Design a protein around this ligand. Structure first.
Ligand code: NA
Ligand code: NA
Lengths: 252, 252
């Protein structure tokens, strides 16, 4: 169903976390039996990048939740690609709905960040997804296509897609409990994969992981994950809880 | 000239720094003879907060370069007041010109952040200052007054002003080499101090430190610092260099 696409389970702690929580959470994670064929990446606040990557069990990668679009400079409050690598980390989440819709990051800025992160040797999780008002207007695909256009035109090469994991999160499902049904997720992922097939490359479309995110839980992950164009999850609230282990083991 | 107001020397590394630079810089800082009657606070990228505060010599405080306006939650890419304290830090720079004019943070948002930081037990360095276009339009005081209004109405009590250090940085002086003259800095600081005297309290106006920032260097700091309403500096580019030591020792 998912061809040669390996399961990917992302977490995003958003603006939560502490040294105490990191110690406990990753002790539980190390003790637990997790699917050895899942890629696991957890986004954490920037002040915890190195500590959490040191404390993470082998195989688990830590992501920055954002970064800026140049290597260094006069950008108070920003985190650079080089600081992420200095902290021992290789992943960054880009274009999350909260950056776009609370902090006003544009498609152009997120595209610029995708290119700079890829050109710095980072792996990226670019986020796409539509507002409730956009879906009601019949613009779900239009919005996702414009977001994918900005991302895709900024992936510097065909090889670079090996370092890209797309996450689709309908904004109305993020933090609301109103999870997309397996049908709703599959429909959008198929449309996005077809877009990548047509506008980028058919080989790459077949290989690129596309995550569903937006109120993924331990009980709903299995049915979302068995959809053929859903390759895994980007988990918010539940990635702070032991439930994240169950979600990791959903395709097991 | 500066009454009972103690010298305050702030640094802002902006989007620069690394574990290697922190080690070297703070070895030089520990070895150097710094004015023992100066408060010294250095803003660093969030991924380095704990490390830099552990490595800083005694007496030197580390600041976050930004924070959000609530304690925790679904705010991808944000740093909270509680994470700053978890990293052993007590200071945050708020409303820096780069946040206002590159990342679109409004007066209302910066006011909300001042109140939340103060209500979390943090010390704050709220930043004010006018664009070149605003000074040419004759609006320098107007802009500073509106920014001070948002800050002042969000300082929860009279005691809380003990945890506030205002920094005035004309945007045209930040990173440009076009330092405000001692005259230009003194004129604005006097106007701002008078504003605090009239709109807040005369006691507080007498005690609150007001920093000048914007292309402060080792050679120009002395004359800026001897101005009676200039209580110290907020230093950008030069706080990455050994010159920061000379600036710290300018009022010596
Ligand atoms: Na580790
Ligand atoms: Na220390």
């Amino acid at each position: 169903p998912h061809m040669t696409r390996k399961l990917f389970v992302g977490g995003n702690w958003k603006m939560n976390g502490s040294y105490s929580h990191i110690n406990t959470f990753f002790d539980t994670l190390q003790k637990a039996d997790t699917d050895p064929n899942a890629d696991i990446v957890i986004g954490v606040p920037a002040c915890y990048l190195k500590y959490a990557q040191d404390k993470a069990p082998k195989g688990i990668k830590i992501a920055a939740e954002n970064c800026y679009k140049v290597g260094s400079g006069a950008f108070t409050g920003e985190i650079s690609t080089e600081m992420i690598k200095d902290c021992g980390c290789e992943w960054v989440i880009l274009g999350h709905s909260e950056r776009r819709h609370i902090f006003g990051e544009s498609n152009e800025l997120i595209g610029e960040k995708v290119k700079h992160a890829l050109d710095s040797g980072l792996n990226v999780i670019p986020c796409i997804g539509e507002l409730l008002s956009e879906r009601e207007a019949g613009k779900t695909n239009d919005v996702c296509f414009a977001q994918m256009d900005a991302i895709a035109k900024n992936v510097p090469s065909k090889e670079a897609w090996d370092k890209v994991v797309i996450a689709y999160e309908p904004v109305w499902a993020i933090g609301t409990g109103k999870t997309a049904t397996p049908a709703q997720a599959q429909e959008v992922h198929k449309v996005v994969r077809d877009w990548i097939r047509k506008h980028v490359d058919a080989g790459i479309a077949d290989k690129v992981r596309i995550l569903y995110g937006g109120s993924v839980t331990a009980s709903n992950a299995k049915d979302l994950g068995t959809q053929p164009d859903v390759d895994g999850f980007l988990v918010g609230g539940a990635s702070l809880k032991p439930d994240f282990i169950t979600i990791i083991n959903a395709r097991r």
